[PDB]
Design a protein around this ligand. Sequence first.
Ligand SMILES: NC(=O)C1=CN([C@@H]2O[C@H](COP(=O)(O)OP(=O)(O)OC[C@H]3O[C@@H](n4cnc5c(N)ncnc54)[C@H](OP(=O)(O)O)[C@@H]3O)[C@@H](O)[C@H]2O)C=CC1
Ligand code: SF4
Ligand code: SF4
Ligand code: SF4
Lengths: 385, 156, 75, 112, 198, 339, 114, 173
Amino acid sequence: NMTLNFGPQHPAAHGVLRLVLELSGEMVRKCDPHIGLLHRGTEKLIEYKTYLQALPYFDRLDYVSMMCNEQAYSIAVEKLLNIQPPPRAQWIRVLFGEITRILNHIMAVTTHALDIGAMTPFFWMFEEREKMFEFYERVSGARMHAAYIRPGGVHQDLPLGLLDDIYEFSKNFSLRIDEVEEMLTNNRIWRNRTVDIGVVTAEDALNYGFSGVMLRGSGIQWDLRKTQPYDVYDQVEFDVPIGSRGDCYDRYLCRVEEMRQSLRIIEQCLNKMPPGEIKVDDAKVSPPKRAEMKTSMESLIHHFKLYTEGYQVPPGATYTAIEAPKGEFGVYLVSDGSSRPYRCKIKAPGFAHLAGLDKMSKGHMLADVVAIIGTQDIVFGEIDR
Amino acid sequence: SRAEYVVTKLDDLINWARRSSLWPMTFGLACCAVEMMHMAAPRYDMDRFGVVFRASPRQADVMIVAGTLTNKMAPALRKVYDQMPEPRYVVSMGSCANGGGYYHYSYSVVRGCDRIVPVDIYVPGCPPTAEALLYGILQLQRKIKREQKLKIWYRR
Amino acid sequence: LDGIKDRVLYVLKLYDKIDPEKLSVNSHFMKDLGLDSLDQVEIIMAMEDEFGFEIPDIDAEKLMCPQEIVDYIAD
Amino acid sequence: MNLYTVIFINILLSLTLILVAFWLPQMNLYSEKANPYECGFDPTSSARLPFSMKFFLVAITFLLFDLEIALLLPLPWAIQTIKTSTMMIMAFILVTILSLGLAYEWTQKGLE
Amino acid sequence: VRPRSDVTHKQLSAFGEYVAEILPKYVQQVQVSCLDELEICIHPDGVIPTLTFLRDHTNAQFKSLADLTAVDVPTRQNRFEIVYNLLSLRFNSRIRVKTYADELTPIDSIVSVHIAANWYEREVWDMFGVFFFNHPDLRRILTDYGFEGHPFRKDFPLTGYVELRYDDEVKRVVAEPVELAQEFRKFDLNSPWEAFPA
Amino acid sequence: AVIPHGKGGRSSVSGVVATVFGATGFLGRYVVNHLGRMGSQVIIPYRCDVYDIMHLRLMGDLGQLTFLEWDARDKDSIRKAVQHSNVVINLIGREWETRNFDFEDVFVNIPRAIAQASKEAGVERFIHVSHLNASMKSSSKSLRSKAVGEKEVRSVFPEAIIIRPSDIFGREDRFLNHFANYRWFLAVPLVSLGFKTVKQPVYVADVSKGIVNATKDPDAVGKTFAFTGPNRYLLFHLVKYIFGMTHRTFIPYPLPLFVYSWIGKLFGLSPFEPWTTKDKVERIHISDVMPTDLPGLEDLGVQPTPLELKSIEVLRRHRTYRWLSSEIEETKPAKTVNY
Amino acid sequence: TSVKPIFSRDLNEAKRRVRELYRAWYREVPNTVHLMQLDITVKQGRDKVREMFMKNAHVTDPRVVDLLVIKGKMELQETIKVWKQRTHVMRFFHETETPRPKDFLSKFYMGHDP
Amino acid sequence: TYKYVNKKVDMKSATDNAARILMWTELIRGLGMTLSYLFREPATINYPFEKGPLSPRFRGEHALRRYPSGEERCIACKLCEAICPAQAITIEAEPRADGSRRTTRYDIDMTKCIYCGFCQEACPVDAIVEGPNFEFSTETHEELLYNKEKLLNNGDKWEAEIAANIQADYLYR
Ligand SMILES: NC(=O)C1=CN([C@@H]2O[C@H](COP(=O)(O)OP(=O)(O)OC[C@H]3O[C@@H](n4cnc5c(N)ncnc54)[C@H](OP(=O)(O)O)[C@@H]3O)[C@@H](O)[C@H]2O)C=CC1
Ligand code: SF4
Ligand code: SF4
Ligand code: SF4
């Protein structure tokens, strides 16, 4: 049983993963993934920071999916305060929530192929990604790591003109997904390296807490967005892409299908986004508008206290989970009455998925392990936190 | 004919060859690779400028330390660094690797990679913009152009 | 039967943190030598390498006598 | 000779390049730069320890199939044999018999 | 104001009694928070039994383990508060079962009940130091290989006690006691005025 | 001055601003190491290219190390380097007098101008470094010159600590590596068959700590400490021992120093850093002076470290595929000849 | 008082486990110094194991001792395998750090707060 | 609403299958796609000559602004320090002889900074702004640490564009 460290710096291994492996022949006898090569303290650091200054940590937890993560903390802090965002902000979060799902899937499908050896899909879709980033930048200011979705709504209304461009792009992106397809969905070779690799049973997927496409790929029907609606994902209409004969190829097809379904959700959001405000009107939770803080005393006091001290969330604890592109992203945020949190365990769709690597890659070749790490969309930020 | 002239010209050639092709290593750690991967991508093609990823450290030069150098990975970085060919340059990318970044005061994060590997160009920004990395890679190219190794040999 | 004692005596003096010519078969590692509890452990282990037989975790506890060790090794 | 002339230039051109490669560059040498590369963390094992391959059978056949190829190499000059029929029968048998051997591998599932 | 649906508050409350009656033995407190969430609290010995009933009961199937965490209330005699959050894909519902464990009084492991916990339990040991009996392979997951101390404990310094740098003399990375060049500025933020509880 | 505040490690202050001119080389790497570890302000003058000076940057806190462009044939460069230093350490030396710098320059001429300016500046102490056993009438132009200088340095910066170290061994050492590097020559040419060559080797670190300590110690003024070592050796055991750890065969071959000085001349002829030199050869076969009375490493606080202890690290790179896994204690340590 | 047990009812049984671990480390020191090419002496290394083992010699609490070996065993595993590369092991020897004197006069001469 | 991504022997059917299997058709299909793009205009930009577009809110590099009169805007309320997530900004102040309130030392550690843009948000006088420039890569770590003089100098250099950018986005804020 030859032992070998897949290696932190592996061109294939996403980020840095030391996958100590015992390989009988080329077959992988045992898979003991090592983690923490990217532990950084995100959970302890948050205890020493106020709610609004811990929002930027969430973007960094799994930064492929920059915003969708922010929505989970937002929702969580809103629940604890029993405040809910204004109607326009909700649609925004679903608009950028979905755009972000595409961004993650373009990452997951194209990076999967680069490790497999197909390199042209990545360049094709990274150009589309690029175009999306620009939406982020023109809405938040940052290409990624925006900090746009804050605990009481979004930070600033969309620029005057973004919606139109999030249309032109959406109107075309489909063809770009279609192309990748003509390149990989039916390749006589993609199928082989992906089909019947890492099959996970339905009962086993629920047991190991997979909770993501990984469950959906095995045929279990669960989309937290339809089962437990958050924001206004209830008012839209989309089809969860369930899969059968769950294997690397089937789940892939599912991720390409949610890229397709997210364009259906984005279209609607553009078609039906309401006129209104983008942040709660409670100066108590949301910072006062700058014209107001510069002309009204109560607004300055509320601006000064909010930025310097904080929300002062009422004491309680909540586990709120959304459907981040990877899977169920949840924040268990225990909170004392103080302005700074007490605990914030981030449930990472990924801590559970990696664990499954062992029960998925059994009697498999070195190349199979590379394919399976891809079909779990492992971003070491969320796993290591 | 003055060898001094002969020397400078020769050095320049040497500098042009190195500066022109800077095969960067594929070192990606804390989600700045996403930006780097953007550089490699079509809007801002790294290749045009000579850059072409080559993971076998042995065959790679510039090491773009994109991301947070956690304590557990610290030794590894040093190793890979030590195993690259002789002329090796390091381009720290990201506030998380220039200094400590959002995670500077943490117990598991090295406050900077320049505490583990000598760093030549520091590219600033939490997700340092891909154009900014490209600016940083281009400044490494001006740093190499100025290097005058053979003239110091001659004058030594 | 004495050959065992011949080896056992050789092992005890070789570590050199014990028996500086005070080596005796009746001598007890813990009782008179003062060698530490742990050091004894090292000793039993030592004996195991030269004898070629590894004694259990417990019986090490009962023998603090080089002569008793030879008693057990012969068994 | 003409070939010998060409070939020695061919080796010379290579040997010239490798040499240039070792004597020209500036070389600083330390242990930590020459210890094996393991994708980072250093080798856990010998890196030369017994490797348990799982495709040997096929490998062996290759050897047997190579030989058959050999026995077939003289076919071009034998297509000329007055005894054309014989050559056909003989050749056909050679390929067929070896084909059977291969199929057996499959039948016995030896290669699989 | 959040869109509370009393329909839920009641149904989950009713289940909370259901469980309390079904396992009188280990359930100490049960409450459905105003946030519409149930948080059965169990004696540490009831870890195995309460989970198993929820994983395998027709009227309460809680198949997947969302998370296993341990808040640390230093004041509390039993420092850690292991919290297990579980989901029911069948009834589209959730429940949190939380127990209490002290530093040297280990909790049972549920890797048997849910194998998801194989990793999270290792995570709780590494960060907080709670120990889980019958765990297949408990060993540090997130911290460095030689790390001393459990980091997420409230009594552990953020910056920690050791940091790493490369030393030429020894040509190898080397720990040294932490010396920080700008200490974490500890802003005091609590206001001396409370908010009259609604 | 700079009141010393801190706990003692990096990011702390010790108050020693020190120019160290030859930091780029073997020992400098060590002198800057401790000075940086202690937290001292270190100004490292350099004329090597910036790429080579990078190894230095990693050692010391943000702002501890300042690098200045400097040319020996320009007095002004030395002037500004010592402008704001209070300790000057001189390690300028070479074995092959180069086309534009001969032994006098590297040992006596330059190291004088330097201390000369240092005084003008008002540096508290100067620590020149000259070789041990650098008799003013020794065989090697080098040793002769080095002595000549120590005479001069005493004039410019009277009582500038001077340290004469014995053969220095440490990773990248000449004394230890060079012998191991004679492998190319199948046999090993040694005058008197490697006998009649008693030498005492000193680990690079030992020498350094001493030097650093010399700066922070009052007694050092007007002293000529001679860092020597923990054990002497006839060159024979040393050579074999080395080959021993390297696990490479040894064939000590007698060859007249007369003819051999010629071999040194041959390598010396080479343009690129002659592998060996007339002088080096003489220096090799030059026995080390007795303990005399000069103070030592332990006097400056650093107890010498035996060669065998760290030899394993210095000679490891020279082993083969398997020999690379042998350790010093299963190996046999060579005998010590005090003579 | 009145405290539940972990793996040993009494210090006695617990000590049994410590003996086993000591043996384990004792038998392992040599291997590590060779598989990691560490520049230390086996005798020296075993001394370290002893020191580390002794550093906690004062404890008399059955429960505390049991955890201590659990933790100790875990360290062994890591070291047994190559999970802990040399940098990790040598750290035990505190080779680079400068030792601090404990003499009062010494501290007075150097640090504001001793 | 759910959907089945991959839910799913006549001679013709079989033959066509064989045609695909032995003529590698689905492989030739893939080659056509890449040949097609080879003919598309590539999307890359000459980086030095042409720059990727950044709109007014781009955070980029920190700068401290001054009033048109010439009085630096910062009045050292020090809540930019309070809301800095990374502890980057260090401010110490004392009353200037004028009697006004000004910062003796304002140090943004850019390596510590994660460019969140909250400081831009928090300032009441809006003295600290996220300036457009993103190209400030530096050879040495010390250069990245910025004191009041570098930021004020950065502010003076980019004030014209900073003013235009704030002009465009202030209604939104
Ligand atoms: N280990 C040994 O062999 C012994 C050494 N010594 C003394 O200790 C000192 C340090 O030894 P070591 O580090 O091994 O010597 P090196 O050969 O490594 O050189 C030491 C330093 O001197 C500098 N230097 C040499 N020549 C010149 C020049 N012409 N102009 C400017 N700078 C120069 C070098 O910089 P650069 O290379 O960039 O020019 C280098 O940084 C030497 O001066 C030597 O006399 C004493 C006894 C034994
Ligand atoms: S710098 Fe900002 S982006 Fe780069 S790694 Fe650290 S956090 Fe992620
Ligand atoms: S907030 Fe604006 S004004 Fe108050 S200190 Fe920071 S910069 Fe100066
Ligand atoms: S940007 Fe965010 S981090 Fe950088 S200074 Fe302004 S606030 Fe602190």
